[PDB]
Design a protein around this ligand. Structure first.
Ligand SMILES: CC(=O)N[C@@H]1[C@@H](O)[C@H](O)[C@@H](CO)O[C@H]1O
Ligand SMILES: [Ca+2]
Length: 510
């Protein structure tokens, strides 16, 4: 039953949360096995990495819990007071602009939103925190002439610093996955600067590289900030590439700016033409990589991160509408929808065909040219390299499953989600037979049985994985009124007329 699954997911969240609160409260990094923790900044000041990333999940569960509503409420209060009284972003330390924007700025914005629409807590606490952090992060856009930011920035001084490696090139997805956050902040503050700075990165990216014509909208993962030109690098929908595509569509869903939908469409058709393929022997659809330009060979290697594509494609085709209604709209893309189901199925198979029921960090699909020390899936559709056997509690597959269920209403997706939730429960638990001490942790190896545990709980286990599994089992969730940032922090769809009155419009074109 949905309500029961709800109780179980809330239970898992609380088991992880109670343990974290008891042993690593206020710390950025936490290891459940040994109950150890530390902060990321050299000076040891906290960034709120886990707390801020988890607040909105607490609010969502508080809103529908029937067994622990009171506990969730108290924890929201605990988190809010800490964010208001302890957390301080005036830190003399360099932080990754992308991660801090999607997790911290995004989490504060979604906490504000949910605090607002759910009337729980004090939304002002989160908004004020978001404005201050947003200002510290925004200084990154002043470093280059192109407007493309360097990878890191000092939260106290505002000094920017290039990527230590890759010849100093920035990761393409890292500066193209900041738009939802800064645009929503612009909307809440009426401050156009946030919007202008974040939209600026696209023109040099598209124009200086002849992106549409030469690359069919597919981006190499590295781009030099000073020139805006791509560096010799792999073209993949995995890490450093993935969210560039995500935010093209999501900006359109959030602000109604059609230019981004058009760009998204171009990239999607390019993806279908150069990266799409099917595995043997189940003919599972998968997106491959091109390490040597579009004219090079196609690699069947696929990061689990690519699995977010199921939900993205479904979202872009339906615009949040249940297919019943979407199928009759002019904007509905039959191709995107069929592929969304296909990719979600493939990603589910990465769990179903896994010895532990959990998909590893990276897999290599069987393209008929898999000819050593690799592990073969149950059906043989993919292999797992010895070095990619870990599982970091990633959400991308349950993410897509959630979208597919709410848009299609096909109960099969809830069955898939339940199986995966069960696999996480049984294969990542520590002190599995004691509800009072049970916790969940990452795996150094999810292929060997019993699985081998790693002493680390990712903030996204709480911010994303458990959140999406939870939403999957909510009977009511209108995907036309919300747009999730890349760390699963929900922002409301913005009113076009209000954006216009605030002079928040597309400041460039192509
Ligand atoms: C009802 C309430 O508590 N409102 C508070 C307000 O007094 C405070 O100035 C602000 C910043 O912390 O947060 C909110
Ligand atoms: Ca994401």
């Amino acid at each position: 039953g949905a309500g029961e699954m709800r109780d179980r997911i809330e239970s898992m969240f609380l088991e992880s949360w109670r343990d974290y609160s008891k042993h690593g409260w206020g710390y950025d990094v936490y290891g459940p096995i040994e109950h150890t923790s530390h902060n990321m900044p050299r000076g040891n000041q906290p960034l709120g990495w886990i707390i801020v990333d988890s607040v909105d999940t607490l609010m969502l569960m508080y809103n529908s819990s029937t067994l622990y509503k009171s506990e969730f409420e108290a924890e929201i209060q605990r988190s809010e007071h800490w964010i208001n009284d302890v957390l301080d972003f005036d830190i003399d330390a360099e932080v990754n602009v992308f991660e801090t924007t999607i997790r911290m700025l995004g989490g504060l914005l979604s906490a504000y939103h949910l605090s607002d629409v759910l009337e729980v807590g004090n939304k002002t606490v989160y908004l004020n925190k978001a404005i201050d952090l947003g200002d510290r992060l925004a200084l990154a856009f002043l470093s280059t002439q192109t407007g493309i930011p360097y990878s890191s920035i000092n939260l106290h001084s505002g000094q920017a610093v290039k990527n230590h490696a890759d010849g100093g090139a920035s990761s393409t997805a890292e500066f193209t996955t900041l738009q939802m956050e800064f645009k929503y902040l612009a909307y809440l503050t009426g401050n156009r600067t946030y919007w202008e700075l974040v939209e600026r990165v696209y023109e040099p990216l598209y124009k200086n590289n002849d992106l549409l014509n030469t690359y069919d909208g597919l981006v190499p993962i590295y781009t030099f900030p000073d020139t805006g030109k791509f560096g010799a690098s792999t073209i993949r929908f995995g890490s450093r590439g993935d969210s560039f595509y995500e935010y093209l569509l999501k900006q359109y869903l959030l602000t109604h700016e059609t230019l981004y939908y058009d760009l998204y469409r171009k990239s999607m058709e390019g993806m279908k033409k150069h990266l799409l393929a099917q595995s043997k022997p189940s003919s599972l659809w998968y997106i491959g990589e091109r390490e040597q330009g579009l004219h090079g060979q196609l690699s069947p290697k696929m990061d689990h991160l690519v699995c977010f594509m199921g939900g993205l494609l479904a979202s872009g085709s339906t615009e949040g509408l249940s297919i019943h209604e979407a199928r009759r709209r002019p904007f509905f893309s039959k191709s995107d929808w069929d592929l969304a189901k296909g990719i979600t199925d493939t990603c589910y198979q990465m769990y179903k065909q896994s010895s532990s029921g959990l998909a590893p960090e990276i897999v290599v699909f069987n393209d008929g040219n898999i000819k050593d020390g690799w592990w073969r899936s149950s059906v043989g559709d993919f292999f797992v390299k010895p070095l990619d056997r870990h599982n970091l509690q990633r959400p991308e597959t349950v993410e897509s499953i959630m979208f597919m269920y709410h848009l299609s209403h096909d109960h099969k997706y809830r069955e898939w989600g339940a199986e995966i939730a069960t696999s996480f429960f049984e294969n990542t638990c520590v002190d599995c037979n004691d509800p009072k001490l049970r916790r969940f942790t990452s795996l150094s190896d999810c292929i060997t049985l019993p699985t081998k545990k790693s002493n680390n709980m990712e903030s996204f286990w709480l911010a994303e994985t458990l959140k999406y599994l939870y939403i999957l089992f909510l009977d009511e969730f209108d995907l036309t009124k919300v747009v999730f940032n890349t760390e699963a922090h929900p922002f409301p769809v913005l009113d076009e007329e209000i954006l216009k009155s605030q002079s928040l419009t597309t400041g460039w074109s192509l």
